Amino acid sequence: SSPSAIMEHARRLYMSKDYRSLESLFGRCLWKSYNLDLWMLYIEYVRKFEVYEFTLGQFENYWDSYGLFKEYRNGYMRALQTPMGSLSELWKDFTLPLFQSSFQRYQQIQPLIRGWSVKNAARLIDLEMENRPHESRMHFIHNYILDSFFYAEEVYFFYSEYLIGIGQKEKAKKVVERGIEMSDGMFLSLYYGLVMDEEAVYGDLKRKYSKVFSKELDLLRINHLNYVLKKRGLELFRKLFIELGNEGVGPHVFIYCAFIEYYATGSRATPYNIFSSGLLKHPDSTLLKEEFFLFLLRIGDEENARALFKRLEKTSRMWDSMIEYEFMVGSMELFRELVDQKMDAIKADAILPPLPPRVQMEGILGRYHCFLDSFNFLDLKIRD
Amino acid sequence: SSPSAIMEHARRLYMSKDYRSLESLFGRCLKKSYNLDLWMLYIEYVRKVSKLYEVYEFTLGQFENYWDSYGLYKEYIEEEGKIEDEQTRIEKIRNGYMRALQTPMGSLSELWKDFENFELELNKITGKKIVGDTLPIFQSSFQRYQQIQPLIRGWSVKNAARLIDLEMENGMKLGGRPHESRMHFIHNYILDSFYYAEEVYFFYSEYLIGIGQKEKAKKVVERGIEMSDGMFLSLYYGLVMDEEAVYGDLKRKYSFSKELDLLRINHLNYVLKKRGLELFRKLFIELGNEGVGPHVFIYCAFIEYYATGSRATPYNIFSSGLLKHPDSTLLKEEFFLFLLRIGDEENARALFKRLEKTSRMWDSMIEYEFMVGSMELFRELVDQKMDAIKADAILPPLPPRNVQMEGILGRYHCFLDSFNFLDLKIRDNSRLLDEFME
Numbered sequence: 150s151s152p153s154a155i156m157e158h159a160r161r162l163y164m165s166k167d168y169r170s171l172e173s174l175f176g177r178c179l180w181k182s183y184n185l186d187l188w189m190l191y192i193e194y195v196r197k198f199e200v201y202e203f204t205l206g207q208f209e210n211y212w213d214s215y216g217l218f219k220e221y222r223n224g225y226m227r228a229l230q231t232p233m234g235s236l237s238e239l240w241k242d243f244t245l246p247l248f249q250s251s252f253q254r255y256q257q258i259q260p261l262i263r264g265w266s267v268k269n270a271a272r273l274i275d276l277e278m279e280n281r282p283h284e285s286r287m288h289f290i291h292n293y294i295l296d297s298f299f300y301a302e303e304v305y306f307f308y309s310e311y312l313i314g315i316g317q318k319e320k321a322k323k324v325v326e327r328g329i330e331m332s333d334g335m336f337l338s339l340y341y342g343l344v345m346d347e348e349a350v351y352g353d354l355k356r357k358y359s360k361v362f363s364k365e366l367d368l369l370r371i372n373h374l375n376y377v378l379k380k381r382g383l384e385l386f387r388k389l390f391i392e393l394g395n396e397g398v399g400p401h402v403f404i405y406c407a408f409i410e411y412y413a414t415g416s417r418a419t420p421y422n423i424f425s426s427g428l429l430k431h432p433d434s435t436l437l438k439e440e441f442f443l444f445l446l447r448i449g450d451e452e453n454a455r456a457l458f459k460r461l462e463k464t465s466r467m468w469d470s471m472i473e474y475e476f477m478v479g480s481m482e483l484f485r486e487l488v489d490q491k492m493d494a495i496k497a498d499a500i501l502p503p504l505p506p507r508v509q510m511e512g513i514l515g516r517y518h519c520f521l522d523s524f525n526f527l528d529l530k531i532r533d
Numbered sequence: 534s535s536p537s538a539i540m541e542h543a544r545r546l547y548m549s550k551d552y553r554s555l556e557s558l559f560g561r562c563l564k565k566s567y568n569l570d571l572w573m574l575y576i577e578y579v580r581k582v583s584k585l586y587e588v589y590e591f592t593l594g595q596f597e598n599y600w601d602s603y604g605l606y607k608e609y610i611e612e613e614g615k616i617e618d619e620q621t622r623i624e625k626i627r628n629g630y631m632r633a634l635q636t637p638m639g640s641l642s643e644l645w646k647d648f649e650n651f652e653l654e655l656n657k658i659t660g661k662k663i664v665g666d667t668l669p670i671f672q673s674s675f676q677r678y679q680q681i682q683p684l685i686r687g688w689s690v691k692n693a694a695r696l697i698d699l700e701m702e703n704g705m706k707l708g709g710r711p712h713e714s715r716m717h718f719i720h721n722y723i724l725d726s727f728y729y730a731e732e733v734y735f736f737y738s739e740y741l742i743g744i745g746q747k748e749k750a751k752k753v754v755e756r757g758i759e760m761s762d763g764m765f766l767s768l769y770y771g772l773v774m775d776e777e778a779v780y781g782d783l784k785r786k787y788s789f790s791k792e793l794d795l796l797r798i799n800h801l802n803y804v805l806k807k808r809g810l811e812l813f814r815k816l817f818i819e820l821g822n823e824g825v826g827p828h829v830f831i832y833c834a835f836i837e838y839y840a841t842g843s844r845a846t847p848y849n850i851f852s853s854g855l856l857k858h859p860d861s862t863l864l865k866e867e868f869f870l871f872l873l874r875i876g877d878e879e880n881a882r883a884l885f886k887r888l889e890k891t892s893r894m895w896d897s898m899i900e901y902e903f904m905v906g907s908m909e910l911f912r913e914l915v916d917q918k919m920d921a922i923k924a925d926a927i928l929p930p931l932p933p934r935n936v937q938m939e940g941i942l943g944r945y946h947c948f949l950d951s952f953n954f955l956d957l958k959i960r961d962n963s964r965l966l967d968e969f970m971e
Contacts, residue, residue, distance in 0.1 A: 375903075379907070400542075448875055473950065473951060491943075495937065515918075523903040
């Protein structure tokens with residue numbers, strides 16, 4: 150039920166002379182459509198001018214409204230107030246300040262329409278945000294973008310954020326629900342759960358994903374825990390963790406909980422115990438082994454760090470962090486032994502395989518990446 | 534007095550026909566030399582102007598179980614010759630063949646053919662038995678060389694280091710004393726071949742330390758400091774040979790802010806290991822306008838946090854560094870990330886809010902607020918970051934921050950990485966390495 154598929158159905162029904170059906174279709178879809186073709190077909194149908202005014206209600210702010218403005222004065226007046234292709238061929242036909250301004254503007258816009266986005270859409274949004282009637286202009290731009298990229302979850306986040314900043318969060322929630330029905334990824338559901346206060350999304354998405362989707366399920370748990378910490382506080386965060394428990398929660402969920410417990414409370418004991426539990430569940434997880442060791446060494450829990458290192462298998466990075474630590478605040482005697490030990494381990498082919506490595510974006514896409522990076526945890530990322 | 538200076542000078546004397554100076558050069562340099570070209574020139578000069586076989590014996594004593602001895606043995610056995618007296622000739626050529634065959638070296642099969650031909654000529658019967666009895670020797674040396682051959686063909690510091698590692702494994706189960714002798718030859722050959730490379734003096738020092746020859750090791754290092762042009766061997770020397778004097782000797786060569794700051798960080802470490810935290814701090818204070826660079830503050834803040842657990846003491850040091858160095862992005866970013874990582878939340882936030890910021894400080898603070906803060910504050914931080922990218926108020930990023938080596942070379946890299954601190958790196962300013970174009 151995409152823009153193009155409503156369009157093609159409408160055109161078939163027109164061609165069929167099924168006017169009962171066509172009239173219900175427009176009835177249901179016209180107000181909501183930011184597709185000019187279609188409006189224009191509504192015009193073709195009605196023809197078989199108060200109805201160019203009705204269309205201009207929708208497309209007056211549009212950079213390709215010229216033929217529409219042409220066919221339709223103080224009509225000439227507040228087209229001249231819209232940056233559009235061929236505005237100079239409307240001036241010539243039609244106050245000079247106002248036109249000049251709208252022609253200067255279409256210069257900055259033209260290359261973004263040329264090369265139409267999703268990333269130039271973002272660029273367009275940002276340009277218009279900076280510089281009641283402005284709001285009206287901004288609604289058109291976001292909805293037209295929603296039509297153009299109905300499939301891309303970013304567009305729905307852009308408008309939602311715009312709407313939130315103008316105090317229209319109820320309208321934002323509806324845009325997100327719609328985005329969730331029309332695009333595909335986990336992002337918009339995570340943003341819906343957290344920003345629009347809907348805890349049900351976490352359980353519902355768990356049931357939907359149902360091994361193959363292990364990453365989704367761990368990223369849901371982490372994000373669900375975050376929701377609960379934010380909305381309810383630590384004791385209910387703590388209760389949700391303990392309930393999650395008769396399912397295989399991945400290595401990441403333990404590492405995430407240990408880190409919340411450390412940075413929220415300052416306990417060293419509790420994260421040690423969460424990392425330790427997790428290592429019992431995932432005895433072969435190099436991630437947990439490395440992140441546990443480096444966490445203990447970085448917060449300064451030396452004695453525990455050293456005992457853990459002695460018991461575990463090691464990546465080169467764990468070896469190199471421990472060697473560098475010993476050199477800085479340890480002894481040369483022990484430093485020399487840890488070097489001997491690392492060279493022995495390389496030789497025995499005993500070093501665990503390495504973990505993968507790892508103002509970027511600006512404006513409203515910048516904002517999106519801010520949310521995305523935050524929902525993502527370490528190398529556990531949203532994936533499709 | 535480098536090997537190459539000596540080879541050049543010797544060729545000069547020889548081509549000039551200044552035969553007096555040349556013979557003097559040979560007298561003072563030969564026995565200390567592991568450069569085969571210099572010894573062959575000596576052979577070539579002795580052939581021209583003069584028991585020649587004795588000069589081959591003198592040369593094969595230096596290049597004992599050398600892997601490119603074939604030309605030496607072949608020419609030597611030609612000289613045995615050319616001995617008046619069958620029995621003594623026979624004796625000598627047999628000992629020559631038998632010494633070669635125990636040596637892993639190129640062209641060993643060609644000496645094997647010559648050897649079998651020689652024994653059979655004397656007696657087809659007793660000779661076949663002599664050869665049969667020597668076959669496993671030859672075969673062992675042939676096999677061993679198959680593993681040496683690609684290291685020599687690809688000769689480099691790294692393959693030199695590999696040859697050291699392979700011979701340290703001791704596959705022939707050499708008794709203590711001839712294994713040591715093997716290793717001394719190998720390391721001295723390497724020192725001569727790469728006389729200018731700090732690595733190889735480290736390789737030899739570490740070998741000698743391990744066999745309880747640490748005074749020998751200190752003189753190896755003293756030679757290397759003279760032959761190389763960086764600050765690796767001097768730091769190694771200070772710390773491993775316990776020689777505090779080297780810190781002031783380096784302070785002269787360099788008074789180069791970055792090198793001065795590396796040298797100060799490493800001197801501070803020497804004092805720490807030797808005399809502990811209290812004398813570490815006295816040295817810090819005295820450095821201590823005298824004036825030192827940001828890295829020295831960051832280094833000392835770390836050593837105090839990790840060594841004593843204090844949060845006040847690192848805070849104060851970072852703070853003092855930032856007052857001496859107000860425009861230091863490295864310091865602002867290092868100080869901020871430190872406070873966030875150890876969980877010093879209120880100091881981290883208060884610091885953040887008064888500093889200029891990299892995108893990484895922004896990103897780390899955004900992430901932290903999302904994780905354990907509030908959503909309205911996350912949103913503001915995100916607002917502020919966008920505003921900051923807009924005003925081009927962002928501080929340009931710190932430089933990005935290698936591969937893993939094994940055996941002896943991997944040991945060199947461990948000592949080097951340890952001496953190095955953050956983006957401060959030792960270098961030899963006279964060597965042109967993989968990225969020389971810069």
